[PDB]
Write a protein that binds this ligand. Structure first.
Ligand SMILES: *[C@@H]1O[C@H](CO)[C@@H](O[C@@H]2O[C@H](CO)[C@@H](O[C@@H]3O[C@H](CO[C@H]4O[C@H](CO[C@H]5O[C@H](CO)[C@@H](O)[C@H](O)[C@@H]5O[C@H]5O[C@H](CO)[C@@H](O)[C@H](O)[C@@H]5O)[C@@H](O)[C@H](O[C@H]5O[C@H](CO)[C@@H](O)[C@H](O)[C@@H]5O[C@H]5O[C@H](CO)[C@@H](O)[C@H](O)[C@@H]5O)[C@@H]4O)[C@@H](O)[C@H](O[C@H]4O[C@H](CO)[C@@H](O)[C@H](O)[C@@H]4O[C@H]4O[C@H](CO)[C@@H](O)[C@H](O)[C@@H]4O[C@H]4O[C@H](CO)[C@@H](O)[C@H](O)[C@@H]4O)[C@@H]3O)[C@H](O)[C@H]2NC(C)=O)[C@H](O)[C@H]1NC(C)=O
Ligand SMILES: *[C@@H]1O[C@H](CO)[C@@H](O[C@@H]2O[C@H](CO)[C@@H](O[C@@H]3O[C@H](CO[C@H]4O[C@H](CO[C@H]5O[C@H](CO)[C@@H](O)[C@H](O)[C@@H]5O)[C@@H](O)[C@H](O[C@H]5O[C@H](CO)[C@@H](O)[C@H](O)[C@@H]5O)[C@@H]4O)[C@@H](O)[C@H](O[C@H]4O[C@H](CO)[C@@H](O)[C@H](O)[C@@H]4O[C@H]4O[C@H](CO)[C@@H](O)[C@H](O)[C@@H]4O[C@H]4O[C@H](CO)[C@@H](O)[C@H](O)[C@@H]4O)[C@@H]3O)[C@H](O)[C@H]2NC(C)=O)[C@H](O)[C@H]1NC(C)=O
Ligand SMILES: *[C@@H]1O[C@H](CO)[C@@H](O[C@@H]2O[C@H](CO)[C@@H](O[C@@H]3O[C@H](CO[C@H]4O[C@H](CO[C@H]5O[C@H](CO)[C@@H](O)[C@H](O)[C@@H]5O)[C@@H](O)[C@H](O[C@H]5O[C@H](CO)[C@@H](O)[C@H](O)[C@@H]5O[C@H]5O[C@H](CO)[C@@H](O)[C@H](O)[C@@H]5O)[C@@H]4O)[C@@H](O)[C@H](O[C@H]4O[C@H](CO)[C@@H](O)[C@H](O)[C@@H]4O)[C@@H]3O)[C@H](O)[C@H]2NC(C)=O)[C@H](O)[C@H]1NC(C)=O
Ligand SMILES: *[C@@H]1O[C@H](CO)[C@@H](O[C@@H]2O[C@H](CO)[C@@H](O[C@@H]3O[C@H](CO[C@H]4O[C@H](CO)[C@@H](O)[C@H](O)[C@@H]4O)[C@@H](O)[C@H](O[C@H]4O[C@H](CO)[C@@H](O)[C@H](O)[C@@H]4O[C@H]4O[C@H](CO)[C@@H](O)[C@H](O)[C@@H]4O[C@H]4O[C@H](CO)[C@@H](O)[C@H](O)[C@@H]4O)[C@@H]3O)[C@H](O)[C@H]2NC(C)=O)[C@H](O)[C@H]1NC(C)=O
Ligand SMILES: *[C@@H]1O[C@H](CO)[C@@H](O[C@@H]2O[C@H](CO)[C@@H](O[C@@H]3O[C@H](CO)[C@@H](O)[C@H](O[C@H]4O[C@H](CO)[C@@H](O)[C@H](O)[C@@H]4O[C@H]4O[C@H](CO)[C@@H](O)[C@H](O)[C@@H]4O)[C@@H]3O)[C@H](O)[C@H]2NC(C)=O)[C@H](O)[C@H]1NC(C)=O
Ligand SMILES: *[C@@H]1O[C@H](CO)[C@@H](O[C@@H]2O[C@H](CO)[C@@H](O[C@@H]3O[C@H](CO)[C@@H](O)[C@H](O)[C@@H]3O)[C@H](O)[C@H]2NC(C)=O)[C@H](O)[C@H]1NC(C)=O
Ligand SMILES: *[C@@H]1O[C@H](CO)[C@@H](O[C@@H]2O[C@H](CO)[C@@H](O)[C@H](O)[C@H]2NC(C)=O)[C@H](O)[C@H]1NC(C)=O
Ligand SMILES: *[C@@H]1O[C@H](CO)[C@@H](O[C@@H]2O[C@H](CO)[C@@H](O)[C@H](O)[C@H]2NC(C)=O)[C@H](O)[C@H]1NC(C)=O
Ligand SMILES: *[C@@H]1O[C@H](CO)[C@@H](O)[C@H](O)[C@H]1NC(C)=O
Ligand SMILES: *[C@@H]1O[C@H](CO)[C@@H](O)[C@H](O)[C@H]1NC(C)=O
Ligand SMILES: *[C@@H]1O[C@H](CO)[C@@H](O)[C@H](O)[C@H]1NC(C)=O
Ligand SMILES: *[C@@H]1O[C@H](CO)[C@@H](O)[C@H](O)[C@H]1NC(C)=O
Ligand SMILES: *[C@@H]1O[C@H](CO)[C@@H](O)[C@H](O)[C@H]1NC(C)=O
Lengths: 224, 450, 122, 212, 122
């Protein structure tokens, strides 16, 4: 059926230009299907950017001329693809971008209203993080239990860019584990934590994998 | 109380919705003077208006899909239903299943069989010892050489009347009152997407129901560039319909000058047997001019690269395999049914813009007993024709398939398609669709009432 | 003939009139050229019966005592006839269409003719 | 340019309940051009209802829309687990389309008190020149809670960051973190560090501290 | 829908509106689902032609200049609408029904339209 597969995660610095692509699988053509680009700010609501419909590119008065939506139809080697380019990137553009499409063939369908429409099919989404910071390795610190019951964990600080994958005993310990989401520190570096609840010897460990910095570093946890 | 306007009924407002209805035919009221005892469709068939009306709708954009078009399905069932109504009053050949004693004709490996058999006369007493002439394709041996009708084990058989003809005549499809037919006037249209310039007509243009495979014959030419159409292009399971710019001259003849026995299997019925062949000893052949086919190919091979990429190798090859209707070029000329070997035309290999004598020929086989459209229970016997048959048609398009073997990023090969006859009707019907008019409408205005 | 379908509703009122109108012994195909035109006259009378039972009783344009509800396409009058088109218009009213139909036959010609009968007595 | 207002921004509802999320537009929308979307956390938003009452094919009959003038409302009967998430209302009435504030539908369950744990700074971190004290709130309901930092019985503003886990898949609970970032110099000038938490589960004030 | 057939004529005037309205290629049974609905539209137009040629020209209720004869069901007005029912009513008029029909087409729309034409000249 209908499948919208977007590009990978793009991390670009302010002032630069970013281009994301949407490969539309299952769509016979963009003639019978209108394509809309919508972004979602983190912790915030959804915002309409622009569209391409009847092969005519269009965008909101916010982005007029600053945003370029181009698309090519179904070819012999690949499904229909649409592309969005944003020049003059800023820090407020860090929203997650979505590639959407809608069936326009039904002329009396409630989906569309003369260019402005709803969105039937949604893509995987593509996150664009705009920051001037440079990639750095995470600093890992153990959290030792003093003494009801007991709780112990590891602290990951000052890494960039996201994400990092934190495990316990290399996936052996999956229960009672709560991994807190990364917080953006005032220094522009990310920090998170992974804590495990323990009753009462086993001598646990932390498994941290940061792919952008290629640091697979592992730290242990000792009670004081 | 609170002002101001009031509802008011308007009748005949321009509002239509996409729908489906039952369409009738039209023959141009000349086809009726062509006579020859109900040629093809036209008998009581509706006379076409001498001045058809086409109204261009300005400031309008309508979205079309030819593969979802319902006019195709009605026409397909029409030709099929038309076919049966033609064979009902005719003479049924049922007692032709008699044993056939056959021998090799006096070159080219004995394609024709001279068959002796027993037959029932007007009287029910004495049989009749008579011989006939059948093509190798019409008979099958059963175990001197003894043969039988090829259709007898599968189904029954009936003979087409010599009075009627299979000659395709222009047929205009029209819509009843309250409906409308939309026409796409753009020069370049692939059958899908929005249409900038749309006009409406009561009747579609002249459409000749020419049933053919691997070659669209006597069709409508495209405008400017040649057209490439496919339901799902990247999908190799879907056929690719092509529309030509310039028509291709093709000659198919029956280089056998024949005679009709007109044997009497009464009372009242007379069968037309194939007598001896007087003339060139030859197999049926189809001619295509080397210069004209090549030029089209060069223009067509460039259009595929608007999809398959600027640079790539496109190789052509003959049919993969299957039923005879699929593997050969099937059509009707002069009442006879030819099956042509198109393998000679499709032998080529192309470069980015180019490919690495005065004439060409194509061996054709003749089969009188046919089941088209995968019909079981009814087999039609094409009656023999006096003299040599010669016919000239336009080749206006193709039915093509893409190989599934990939190596998608390397090269692609295309082969002649077949099967579904709806594609043949989709070739002429791509620019039309049916909508029903909704005249009733309501609008607010001040008039109220006394 | 449909020429104003792309034009505005205001311009579409001029050409309204053109839209109103544009052996037989065979065993088969006789039903094909019949079934089409019979449902046509059935579809024709289907519209005309509605025209009579409403406050029209006549063709083309006719008015009624049904007040236009604000909740039904709240608009500017020039935003309707001058700035908008019929296909685009029927699109929004699609929800209230069945509601309006009831007001014509029930609220009017049922309650109007009876109102008329009472006003015709004196 | 339309502005969409949703109420509430988030709500607590149980399984089997009938949930009503309303929405109001800056102007009156007629022709009823309005859409409602469902978004489960970490997943792309899915289209549920268009034109305000019209349910999309494949969607369960439990969802019901209502559209009149400026006031719009979406009604969900027999609430179930898969229905929990964040919902959005959108208007395609005019160019361009604008969405609503969003409404987070949150699982209802008995109020659960947190178990507070405090972690003193690691040794290796102390050598870096900065010290971070981490206050922990384990599984608790509801999500809303307060954590204040008292140093030698004195409140602190700034240099404080908290983190909240998503509602747990099974326990339907939340977990909270608190991060206090200070330098090494300022860290040595004080003695006792305390973590004060107040939540609907405790029904009493709680404070966790360390004498280092 | 016929609900007042048992009720009095006076109550029966309220629900009057509801009474107004409620492949095909087969060789056989196609004539069975056809012959029924064709005489239906023939029976339909048969009533409507009478409605036009009389002083009605419109559906539901309409009045006329034909005076009610005493010899035709001499009655009390409240004995008709309030105390009596339609099936019971059509029973007595059964003899004068064909007489009344003549007064509508002959005495009125034949003599009225001509009367109107003479009144429309001045
Ligand atoms: C069937 O049939 C049908 C019919 O017949 C068909 O259809 C078709 O289709 C096709 C497709 O395939 C198409 O084509 C397409 O188109 C599209 C569109 O275009 C349009 O648009 C554009 C854009 O727009 C924008 O911009 C502008 C500027 O200028 C403006 O003005 C506008 O307005 C817009 O804007 C907007 O927005 C903004 C924001 O955003 C705001 O602000 C504002 O306000 C607004 O709203 C444009 O540009 C264009 O234009 C152009 O063109 C035209 C013609 O066409 C012209 O007239 C003009 O003037 C111009 O021109 C120029 O250019 C051209 C180009 O080509 C040339 O040719 C000329 O000469 C000149 O130079 C229009 O308007 C488009 O987009 C596309 O494109 C694409 O493709 C191509 C190839 O083909 C290429 O080359 C390109 O490049 C592109 O690609 C892209 O994309 C892709 C995908 O996505 C990718 O992959 C790639 O890579 C690329 O990307 C790149 O680039 C970008 C930029 O762009 C960037 O970003 C990135 O990064 C990279 O770099 C195409 O072309 C057609 O049209 C149709 N047709 C009709 C008739 O319609 C179908 O197809 C069939 N089918 C089958 C199956 O067969
Ligand atoms: C007309 O014809 C055209 C062609 O002629 C037809 O086009 C065909 O359309 C179909 C769609 O029906 C396509 O199949 C789908 O393909 C997509 C995309 O697959 C591609 O991309 C994937 C990801 O690429 C990205 O990531 C990589 C890694 O970073 C990156 O490098 C890359 O650049 C890109 O950025 C690849 O994973 C994928 O590779 C895999 O598949 C190849 C094809 O089989 C194979 O060769 C590879 O070896 C590899 O195995 C490929 O490159 C698929 O996503 C999609 O899969 C869905 O459908 C299948 C059934 O076919 C189902 O089994 C799957 O589970 C999956 O369904 C998921 O998605 C649904 C939609 O979101 C969702 O509803 C489901 O519930 C399910 O999601 C569940 O699981 C996920 C985790 O698995 C979980 O997160 C969810 O929450 C949920 O639980 C299809 O396979 C054809 O590819 C395409 N043809 C061609 C030639 O491409 C068209 O259909 C025709 N139309 C008509 C009308 O006629
Ligand atoms: C104001 O007016 C507007 C007028 O549009 C009102 O909008 C309409 O409101 C209705 C109120 O409920 C809606 O009814 C409900 O519709 C659901 C979805 O219907 C649409 O989507 C279908 C799904 O399409 C997806 O899936 C297919 C298959 O995979 C894909 O191919 C698609 O691409 C999509 O991914 C779609 O199939 C429908 O289209 C079919 O039906 C409509 C009529 O409704 C026809 O016009 C279409 O031509 C088409 O019919 C053809 O195709 C089907 C096969 O698809 C054939 O079987 C047919 O014979 C025919 O050939 C729609 O566009 C339904 O799922 C839903 O049914 C469920 O729920 C009800 C209870 O609500 C149950 O009773 C059912 O049993 C079932 O559980 C329900 O019918 C209309 O969809 C909606 N839109 C329209 C009509 O276009 C609006 O509400 C009004 N406002 C107010 C306030 O009232
Ligand atoms: C795609 O479209 C193209 C173009 O539209 C189609 O091509 C059409 O093909 C038709 C045949 O299927 C063909 O019809 C022919 O018309 C010819 C011209 O007729 C006009 O001229 C004559 C005068 O010559 C006028 O009297 C007449 O009124 C017309 O104005 C006819 O000459 C053709 O008859 C001959 O051919 C057919 C088969 O093609 C035979 O059945 C027929 O019997 C005729 O053959 C005899 O006559 C020729 C000489 O004329 C002899 O050489 C031959 O051997 C035959 O002679 C013996 O047989 C007869 C009895 O059959 C006997 O009396 C005699 O003594 C001998 O024993 C035929 O009527 C269309 O004209 C043609 N279109 C055009 C524009 O030309 C193509 O089919 C379409 N594709 C498909 C798939 O349908
Ligand atoms: C399918 O069949 C069709 C029909 O047969 C083919 O199309 C025909 O193709 C031929 C040749 O390609 C063409 O014949 C020529 O037509 C010219 C007019 O267009 C004629 O002028 C010309 O006649 C001269 O040449 C003949 C042979 O050399 C002579 O016999 C004849 O008398 C002519 O000679 C005269 O003229 C010269 C000056 O030029 C003068 O000096 C002489 O004194 C004398 O006066 C040819 O006959 C047909 O016109 C084509 N028909 C159509 C309808 O287009 C088609 O090619 C076939 N396709 C395939 C694939 O085989
Ligand atoms: C296949 O198509 C090609 C065209 O792509 C055909 O090539 C054509 O060949 C003829 C010669 O046989 C060329 O005519 C020549 O014209 C030039 C210029 O007037 C003249 O100098 C030569 O003496 C000769 O007359 C013709 O131009 C050329 N086509 C093009 C477009 O240039 C080829 O003929 C086709 N295949 C066959 C069967 O030949
Ligand atoms: C096909 O075979 C038949 C015989 O079955 C041939 O007819 C015979 O032809 C010879 C001429 O050499 C005559 O002497 C015989 O009298 C014929 N017999 C009959 C029964 O007709 C026929 O000639 C063969 N095919 C043809 C006509 O070449
Ligand atoms: C159709 O044309 C092809 C190409 O000429 C024929 O292929 C020949 O097949 C025979 C065996 O039947 C081989 O001996 C030849 O070598 C083949 N020719 C070539 C050029 O390879 C084919 O036979 C023709 N007809 C059919 C019915 O297949
Ligand atoms: C043409 O029609 C469109 C939509 O129907 C409308 O927006 C436009 O104003 C119309 N043009 C004119 C000149 O009326
Ligand atoms: C195809 O050709 C066009 C110009 O004809 C060019 O812009 C494009 O880059 C080419 N694509 C390739 C070589 O993949
Ligand atoms: C209504 O139409 C008048 C045209 O005279 C225009 O000036 C006014 O701005 C319009 N107001 C609204 C609310 O559409
Ligand atoms: C006529 O009706 C009146 C009702 O007011 C009644 O009092 C009177 O007796 C009736 N007379 C006859 C003769 O029916
Ligand atoms: C019911 O009908 C009968 C005969 O039709 C009539 O006599 C009687 O008065 C009616 N009942 C009422 C309550 O009107």
């Amino acid at each position: 059926q209908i499948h919208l597969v977007q590009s990978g995660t793009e991390v670009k610095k302010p002032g630069s230009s970013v281009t994301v692509s949407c490969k539309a699988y299952g769509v016979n053509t963009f003639g019978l299907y209108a394509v809309n680009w919508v972004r979602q700010a983190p912790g915030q609501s959804l915002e309409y950017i622009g569209q391409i419909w009847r092969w005519k590119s269009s965008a909101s008065h916010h982005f007029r001329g600053r945003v370029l939506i181009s698309a090519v139809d179904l070819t012999g080697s690949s499904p229909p693809i649409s592309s969005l380019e944003i020049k003059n990137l800023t820090s407020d553009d860090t929203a997650v971008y979505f590639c959407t499409t809608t069936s326009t063939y039904d002329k009396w369908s409630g989906l569309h209203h003369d260019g402005v429409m709803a969105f039937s099919s949604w893509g995987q989404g593509t996150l664009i993080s705009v920051s001037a910071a440079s990639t750095k390795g995470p600093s890992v610190f153990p959290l030792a239990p003093s003494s009801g019951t007991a709780a112990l964990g590891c602290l990951v600080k000052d890494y960039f860019p996201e994400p990092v994958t934190v495990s316990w005993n290399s996936g052996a310990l999956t229960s009672g584990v709560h991994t807190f989401p990364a917080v953006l520190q005032s220094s522009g570096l990310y920090s998170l934590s992974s804590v495990v609840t323990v009753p009462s010897t086993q001598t646990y460990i932390c498994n941290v994998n940061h792919k952008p910095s290629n640091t697979k570093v592992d730290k242990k946890v000792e009670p004081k | 109380r609170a002002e101001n306007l009031w509802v008011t009924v308007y009748y005949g407002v321009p509002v239509w919705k996409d729908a489906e209805t039952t369409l009738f035919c039209a023959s141009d009221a000349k086809a009726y003077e062509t006579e020859k005892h109900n040629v093809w469709a036209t008998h009581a068939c509706v006379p076409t208006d001498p001045n058809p009306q086409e109204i261009h709708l300005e400031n309008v954009t309508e979205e079309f899909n030819m593969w979802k078009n319902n006019m195709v399905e009605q026409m397909h069932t029409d030709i099929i239903s038309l076919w049966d109504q033609s064979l009902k009053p005719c003479v049924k050949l049922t007692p032709l299943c008699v044993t056939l004693q056959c021998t090799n004709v006096t070159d080219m490996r004995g394609e024709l069989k001279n068959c002796s058999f027993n037959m029932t006369t007007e009287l029910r007493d004495k049989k009749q010892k008579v011989y006939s002439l059948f093509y190798r394709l019409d008979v099958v041996q059963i175990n001197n050489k003894e043969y039988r009708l090829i259709n007898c084990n599968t189904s029954a058989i009936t003979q087409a009347c010599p009075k009627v003809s299979f000659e395709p005549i222009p047929i205009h499809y029209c819509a009843p009152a309250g409906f409308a037919i939309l026409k796409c006037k753009d020069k370049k249209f692939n059958g899908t997407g929005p249409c900038p310039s749309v006009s409406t007509v009561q009747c579609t243009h002249g459409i000749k129901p020419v049933v053919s495979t691997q070659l669209l014959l006597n069709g409508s030419l495209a405008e400017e560039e040649v057209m490439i159409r496919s339901e799902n292009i990247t999908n190799n399971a879907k056929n690719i319909l092509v529309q030509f710019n310039t028509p291709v001259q093709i000659n198919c003849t029956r280089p056998n000058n024949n005679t009709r026995k007109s044997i009497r299997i009464g009372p009242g019925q007379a069968f037309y047997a194939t007598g001896d062949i007087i003339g060139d000893i030859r197999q049926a052949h189809c001619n295509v001019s080397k210069a004209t086919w090549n030029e089209t190919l060069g223009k067509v091979v460039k259009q595929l690269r608007k999809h398959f990429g600027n640079n790539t190798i496109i190789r052509f090859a003959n049919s993969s395999g299957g039923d005879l209707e699929v593997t050969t070029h099937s059509f009707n000329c002069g009442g006879e049914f030819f099956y042509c070997n198109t393998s000679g035309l499709f032998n080529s290999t192309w470069i980015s813009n180019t490919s690495v004598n005065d004439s060409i020929t194509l061996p054709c086989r003749i089969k009188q007993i046919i089941n088209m459209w995968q019909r079981i229970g009814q087999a039609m016997y094409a009656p023999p024709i006096q003299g040599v048959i010669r016919c000239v048609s336009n080749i206006t398009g193709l039915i093509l398939t893409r190989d599934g073997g990939s190596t998608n990023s390397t090269t692609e090969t295309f082969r002649p398609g077949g099967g579904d006859m709806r594609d043949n009707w989709r070739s002429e019907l791509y620019k039309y669709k049916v909508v029903k008019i909704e005249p009733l409408g309501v609008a607010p205005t001040r008039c109220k009432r006394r | 003939f449909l020429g104003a379908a792309g034009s505005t509703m205001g311009a579409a009122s001029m050409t309204l009139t053109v839209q109103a109108r544009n052996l037989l012994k065979l065993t088969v195909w006789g039903i094909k050229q019949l079934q089409a035109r019979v449902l046509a006259v059935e579809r024709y009378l289907r519209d005309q019966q509605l025209l009579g039972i409403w406050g029209c009783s006549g063709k083309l344009i006719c008015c009624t005592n049904v007040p236009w509800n604000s909740s039904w396409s709240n608009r500017n009058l020039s935003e309707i006839w001058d700035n908008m088109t019929w296909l685009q218009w029927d699109k929004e009213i699609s929800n209230y269409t069945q509601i309006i139909y009831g007001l014509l036959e029930e609220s009017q010609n049922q309650q109007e003719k009876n109102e008329q009968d009472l006003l015709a007595l004196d | 340019d339309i502005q969409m207002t949703q109420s509430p921004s988030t709500l607590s509802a149980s399984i089997g309940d009938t949930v009503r999320i309303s929405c109001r537009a800056s102007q009156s929308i007629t022709g009823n051009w309005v859409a409602w979307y469902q978004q489960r956390p970490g997943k792309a938003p899915r289209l549920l209802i268009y034109r305000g009452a019209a349910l999309l094919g494949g969607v369960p009959s439990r969802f019901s829309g209502s559209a009149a003038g400026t006031d719009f409302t979406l009604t969900i009967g027999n609430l179930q687990a898969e229905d929990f998430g964040t919902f959005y209302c959108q208007q395609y009435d005019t160019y361009p389309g604008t969405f609503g504030q969003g409404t987070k539908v949150e699982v209802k369950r008995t109020v659960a008190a947190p178990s507070v744990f405090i972690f003193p700074p690691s040794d290796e971190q102390l050598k870096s020149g900065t010290a971070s004290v981490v206050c922990l709130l384990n599984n608790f309901y509801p999500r809303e809670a307060k954590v204040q930092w008292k140093v030698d019985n004195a409140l602190q503003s700034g240099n404080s960051q908290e983190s909240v886990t998503e509602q747990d898949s099974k326990d339907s609970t939340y977990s909270l973190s608190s991060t206090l970032t200070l330098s090494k110099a300022d860290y040595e000038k004080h003695k006792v560090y305390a973590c004060e938490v107040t939540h609907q589960g405790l029904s009493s004030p709680v404070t966790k501290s360390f004498n280092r």
